[PDB]
Amino acid sequence: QGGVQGGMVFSIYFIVLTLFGNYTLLNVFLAIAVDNLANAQELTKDEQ
Amino acid sequence: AYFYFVSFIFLCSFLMLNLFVAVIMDNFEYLTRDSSILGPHHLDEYVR
Amino acid sequence: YIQGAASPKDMLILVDVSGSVSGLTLKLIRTSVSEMLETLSDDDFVNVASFNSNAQDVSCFQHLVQANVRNKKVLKDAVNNITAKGITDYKKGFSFA
Amino acid sequence: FYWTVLSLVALNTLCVAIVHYNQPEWLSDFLYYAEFIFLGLFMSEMFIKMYGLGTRPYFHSSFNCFDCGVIIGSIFEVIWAVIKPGTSFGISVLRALRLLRIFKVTKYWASLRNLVVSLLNSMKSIISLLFLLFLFIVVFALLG
Amino acid sequence: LIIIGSFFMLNLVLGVLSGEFAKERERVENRRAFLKLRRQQQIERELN
Amino acid sequence: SIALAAEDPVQPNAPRNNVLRYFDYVFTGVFTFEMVIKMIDLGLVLHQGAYFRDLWNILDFIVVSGALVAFAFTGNSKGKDINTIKSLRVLRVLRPLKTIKRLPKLKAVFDCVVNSLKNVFNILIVYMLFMFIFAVVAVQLFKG
Amino acid sequence: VVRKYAKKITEWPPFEYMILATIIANCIVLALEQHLPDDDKTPMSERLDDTEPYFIGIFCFEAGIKIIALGFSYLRNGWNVMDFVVVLTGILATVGTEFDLRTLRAVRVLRPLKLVSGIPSLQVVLKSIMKAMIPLLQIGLLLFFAILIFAIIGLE
Amino acid sequence: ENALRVFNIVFTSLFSLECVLKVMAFGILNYFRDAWNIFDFVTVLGSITDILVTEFLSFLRLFRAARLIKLLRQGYTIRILLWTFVQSFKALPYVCLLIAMLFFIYAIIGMQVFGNIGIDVEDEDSDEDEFQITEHNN
Amino acid sequence: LLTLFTVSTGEGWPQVLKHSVDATFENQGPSPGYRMEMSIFYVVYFVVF
Ligand SMILES: CC(C)CCC[C@@H](C)[C@H]1CC[C@H]2[C@@H]3CC=C4C[C@@H](OC(=O)CCC(=O)O)CC[C@]4(C)[C@H]3CC[C@]12C
Ligand SMILES: CC(C)CCC[C@@H](C)[C@H]1CC[C@H]2[C@@H]3CC=C4C[C@@H](OC(=O)CCC(=O)O)CC[C@]4(C)[C@H]3CC[C@]12C
Ligand SMILES: CC(C)CCC[C@@H](C)[C@H]1CC[C@H]2[C@@H]3CC=C4C[C@@H](OC(=O)CCC(=O)O)CC[C@]4(C)[C@H]3CC[C@]12C
Ligand SMILES: CC(C)CCC[C@@H](C)[C@H]1CC[C@H]2[C@@H]3CC=C4C[C@@H](O)CC[C@]4(C)[C@H]3CC[C@]12C
Ligand SMILES: CC(C)CCC[C@@H](C)[C@H]1CC[C@H]2[C@@H]3CC=C4C[C@@H](O)CC[C@]4(C)[C@H]3CC[C@]12C
Ligand SMILES: CC(C)CCC[C@@H](C)[C@H]1CC[C@H]2[C@@H]3CC=C4C[C@@H](O)CC[C@]4(C)[C@H]3CC[C@]12C
Ligand SMILES: [Ca+2]
């Protein structure tokens, strides 16, 4: 889109994608890991 | 050079991760705080 | 070699200048057309046309010109100043050629 | 029986790892026949349990169903190689996942089994999470 | 710039998220689902 | 440790390296003296208080032994075998690790890191098995 | 904004399934489009483009049914608001071209998000993700201040 | 450029009045017992220093750039979160030391093994991915 | 394993992906965009590890 002269407003697409994508991935996968591992720890302790 | 760099990436990430959890789990009372239940953070409001 | 390898020709280069040839393909096309024009003698007659959606002549020539050292220069200069924009129509470029 | 079939899986796992870019021709011939030998033994190991334990008790076991899939997949690959030579996926390597059963002898089975139990419990949630994550990629892909 | 901007912020993000996941586990609706999971496992052990 | 950081790698015959070489003799001498008295106070034989029983003692033993052996090869002829003596000089990088045992709070942090490895070891084995499966599949797809 | 209650007819289960099917079809149609430089179109582009009236008409019809049944509690739901703006922007571009309306085609990218509105199960999962990142906004305020300070220093 | 510099003189004057006004009100000693007051005092002293020299480099006026941090105290939850984590890094000094030793040991091994590699090599081929050991990276 | 470890750290995998899709046959050179279905290998790999 033009260059540095006219296309600098298009960096917002990339900034939003990497900023949101970086932490959305962390939120989704860390929540999966924490919840399922914490369940397994309590579930194991209770049976013992 | 294969062992030099491959082991460094594992050890640097592992040691840095242990630093993160040590700092996180030191303030774990604050991170899991609830506004309803009294906490040390509330007591500063009494001082002012 | 070119003189002894074939007989005099009546060549009509048909260049596609629709939108999709924009960028590298256009530079390759112009270089290819120039290099093809270099393989033409004075016994050979050539004219270059282009088509995006309506065919037109690239240069002032309208019918066919012998490949002099100067007619070829005119054609090369005209080819080096074409731009890509439109939707290809083969039935209108071939009916022109 | 339990340890003997498990030792066969270790040999099969080793066999698929030896393959390299320029392996000697004698190695290729040995591995070509060895795949059929290993495939035959595991298909027979399927049928012994099927007749020994009954068709219904065998299939209802979750572990045995996984063995079925790799066995069926292995048959699919060999016929696929003849029809369209040039492509091999090494589906037989998935049999190496049976080595995780060795954790039963250790004290660590309870922790590992419970993690899989909890993952299968919330399978509906995990699939929905990946779909929503996939949807936002599609929206950003369409915007790009 | 890297230490403060990248490694220190990553530490807070893990810290804040981990605290939130701990609080979410002890929610009433989430605890009941786990209690159902624990009972269902106890049946399977005895049934086997 | 600071001496190992000043040394010039590019210039083997740099004036600085010549000066630092004399310092290497002294530091080995100090480590030799503390080694023998630790062997004298304790026992080499495995009488449950053995000097070789403690793991860090082997680590101390390696550093001093490599320095002494490196002198023997250099002693006979200075440049008869440059390759192995250059390899032995690298063992000096273990000097900073001798700090961990002596400092109480540094050892405590070290034990916590080792404790974390023990907890995640069982998952680490599962991680490598899954990565092994992907590696074997990737070989079949893109070999050659 | 309706004629109070006068033979108002509500929905039945196949209706939302038909809506779901047409949304999936629209997503496939969007995924089948190829963009070529400098006003060049592929032959399939015209065939894909002429399908837009059908999709927009179906969406307008379902929005009309919901708006008359609820009575314009339609805009109370956030998902319906997103549905309404999708319908509105489409009609402006589809009907009439006097103003510059190539930009308004970019709003079509949000149509796959109508899968979340249609399927109530996905809404509950989506609530879980956004709930956790509410605290993270305060981290972003620290991040912006850190970037601002280092940008000034780098500027100097 | 001159207009921007003029506004600096206006602000550094007012920011000096606040220090003068607080010191008299709080007292010489009590005022100098608060961390922000010294931080404010060193900032005004640094900025006023450069101005006189110009008439008779100012990178220490970037301490004035740090004045924006004072706005953080208004937002409570950010201030507590930032302060608590900073205090935790002070209570764990040896954990940071272990990371420093890993960098130390791996640095010395690199110098002895990979130090000899030459960097002056450059050619028209210029396979930049091939050669990453350069004047800057070595 | 070394190549996959590089991809796990995230550095340079776009080039590894480009080489993977352009591969044609054993002992034969690349051809651009030959096997574009091999992208599924790296997408599944990222999800897991
Ligand atoms: C489950 C684990 C423990 C299995 C054992 C590990 C194998 C996956 C690895 C270990 C070492 C590897 C070997 C290391 C080096 C070579 C030499 C290589 O031969 C050549 O480089 C040239 C051969 C020729 O030209 O004759 C062939 C592959 C092979 C045997 C490798 C095959 C794969 C091996 C056996
Ligand atoms: C961070 C902790 C571990 C202490 C820091 C250790 C090193 C980073 C320092 C300590 C002493 C320093 C050295 C002290 C003196 C010199 C000589 C100085 O003079 C020269 O240019 C070489 C001499 C000559 O030209 O003859 C060059 C830097 C150097 C090697 C210094 C490089 C950096 C060193 C190794
Ligand atoms: C977070 C996760 C769940 C989302 C990952 C997205 C995948 C579902 C996407 C990303 C890359 C896509 C692939 C990119 C390339 C191709 C090749 C292409 O197939 C062809 O043969 C097309 C020919 C050509 O393009 O030249 C279309 C399917 C496929 C495998 C795509 C299938 C869908 C994939 C795997
Ligand atoms: C014992 C600890 C402090 C080790 C410290 C040694 C350092 C600080 C000393 C020891 C040997 C010294 C070097 C000896 C050789 C030279 C070459 C000479 O022409 C200039 C000074 C220079 C470069 C010295 C710099 C400082 C130096 C490296
Ligand atoms: C030690 C081995 C396993 C790899 C070293 C760890 C680092 C280099 C790797 C492993 C996990 C990787 C991250 C895992 C999580 C994500 C998801 C998203 O948030 C951005 C990518 C990102 C950030 C990856 C980038 C690089 C990463 C941090
Ligand atoms: C989770 C464990 C079991 C890992 C095993 C799954 C991996 C190895 C499988 C799952 C999906 C598979 C891909 C599916 C489709 C194709 C297209 C085909 O033309 C080439 C192989 C390729 C690209 C496969 C490669 C192997 C693959 C990535
Ligand atoms: Ca075209």
Swiss-Prot record, chain C:
What tissues express this gene product? Isoform 1 is expressed in skeletal muscle. Isoform 2 is expressed in the central nervous system. Isoform 2, isoform 4 and isoform 5 are expressed in neuroblastoma cells. Isoform 3, isoform 4 and isoform 5 are expressed in the aorta.
Q: Where is this motif: MIDAS-like motif?
A: 16-20
> What lineage is this protein's organism placed in?
Eukaryota, Metazoa, Chordata, Craniata, Vertebrata
Name this protein carries in UniProt: Voltage-dependent calcium channel subunit alpha-2/delta-1
- Which family, according to UniProt? Belongs to the calcium channel subunit alpha-2/delta family.
Task: Summarize the PTM comment.
Answer: Proteolytically processed into subunits alpha-2-1 and delta-1 that are disulfide-linked.
State what this protein does. The alpha-2/delta subunit of voltage-dependent calcium channels regulates calcium current density and activation/inactivation kinetics of the calcium channel. Plays an important role in excitation-contraction coupling.
In terms of domain of life, where is this protein from?
Answer: Eukaryota
- Note on file? Binds gabapentin, an antiepileptic drug.
Q: What is known of its domains?
A: The MIDAS-like motif in the VWFA domain binds divalent metal cations and is required to promote trafficking of the alpha-1 (CACNA1) subunit to the plasma membrane by an integrin-like switch.
Q: How does it assemble?
A: Dimer formed of alpha-2-1 and delta-1 chains; disulfide-linked. Voltage-dependent calcium channels are multisubunit complexes, consisting of alpha-1 (CACNA1), alpha-2 (CACNA2D), beta (CACNB) and delta (CACNA2D) subunits in a 1:1:1:1 ratio.
Enumerate the subcellular locations listed in this protein's record, separating them with semicolons. Answer: Membrane; Cell membrane
The UniProt record gives the binding positions of a divalent metal cation as: D16, S18, S20
**Residues modified by glycosylation:** N81
From Swiss-Prot, chain E:
Signal peptide range equals none
Tied to what disorder?
Answer: Spinocerebellar ataxia 6: Spinocerebellar ataxia is a clinically and genetically heterogeneous group of cerebellar disorders. Patients show progressive incoordination of gait and often poor coordination of hands, speech and eye movements, due to degeneration of the cerebellum with variable involvement of the brainstem and spinal cord. SCA6 is an autosomal dominant cerebellar ataxia (ADCA), mainly caused by expansion of a CAG repeat in the coding region of CACNA1A. There seems to be a correlation between the repeat number and earlier onset of the disorder. Migraine, familial hemiplegic, 1: A subtype of migraine with aura associated with ictal hemiparesis and, in some families, cerebellar ataxia and atrophy. Migraine is a disabling symptom complex of periodic headaches, usually temporal and unilateral. Headaches are often accompanied by irritability, nausea, vomiting and photophobia, preceded by constriction of the cranial arteries. Migraine with aura is characterized by recurrent attacks of reversible neurological symptoms (aura) that precede or accompany the headache.
The text of the family note is: Belongs to the calcium channel alpha-1 subunit (TC 1.A.1.11) family. CACNA1A subfamily.
Location in the cell reads: Cell membrane
- Its protein name is Voltage-dependent P/Q-type calcium channel subunit alpha-1A
Curated annotation (Swiss-Prot), chain F:
Q: Which residues cross the membrane?
A: 21-40, 53-71, 83-101, 121-140
Q: Which family does it belong to?
A: Belongs to the calcium channel alpha-1 subunit (TC 1.A.1.11) family. CACNA1A subfamily.
Location in or out of the cell? Cell membrane
Topology feature Extracellular, residues? 5-20, 72-82
Q: What protein name applies here? A: Voltage-dependent P/Q-type calcium channel subunit alpha-1A
**What does this gene product do?**
Voltage-sensitive calcium channels (VSCC) mediate the entry of calcium ions into excitable cells and are also involved in a variety of calcium-dependent processes, including muscle contraction, hormone or neurotransmitter release, gene expression, cell motility, cell division and cell death. The isoform alpha-1A gives rise to P and/or Q-type calcium currents. P/Q-type calcium channels belong to the 'high-voltage activated' (HVA) group and are specifically blocked by the spider omega-agatoxin-IVA (AC P54282). They are however insensitive to dihydropyridines (DHP).
- Gene behind this chain? CACNA1A
Which species is this record about?
Answer: Homo sapiens (Human)
Read off the domain note.
Each of the four internal repeats contains five hydrophobic transmembrane segments (S1, S2, S3, S5, S6) and one positively charged transmembrane segment (S4). S4 segments probably represent the voltage-sensor and are characterized by a series of positively charged amino acids at every third position.
**Per the record, what ranges lie on the membrane's Cytoplasmic side?**
41-52, 102-120
Swiss-Prot record, chain I:
Instruction: Please tell me in which tissues this protein is expressed.
Output: Brain specific; mainly found in cerebellum, cerebral cortex, thalamus and hypothalamus. Expressed in the small cell lung carcinoma cell line SCC-9. No expression in heart, kidney, liver or muscle. Purkinje cells contain predominantly P-type VSCC, the Q-type being a prominent calcium current in cerebellar granule cells.
Locations listed in the record: Cell membrane
Give residues annotated as binding Ca(2+).
Answer: E11
Domain topic, free-text comment: Each of the four internal repeats contains five hydrophobic transmembrane segments (S1, S2, S3, S5, S6) and one positively charged transmembrane segment (S4). S4 segments probably represent the voltage-sensor and are characterized by a series of positively charged amino acids at every third position.
Q: What's the family?
A: Belongs to the calcium channel alpha-1 subunit (TC 1.A.1.11) family. CACNA1A subfamily.
Question: Which protein are we looking at?
Answer: Voltage-dependent P/Q-type calcium channel subunit alpha-1A
Q: Give the gene symbol.
A: CACNA1A
Residues represented out of the complete protein:
1449 to 1497 of 2506
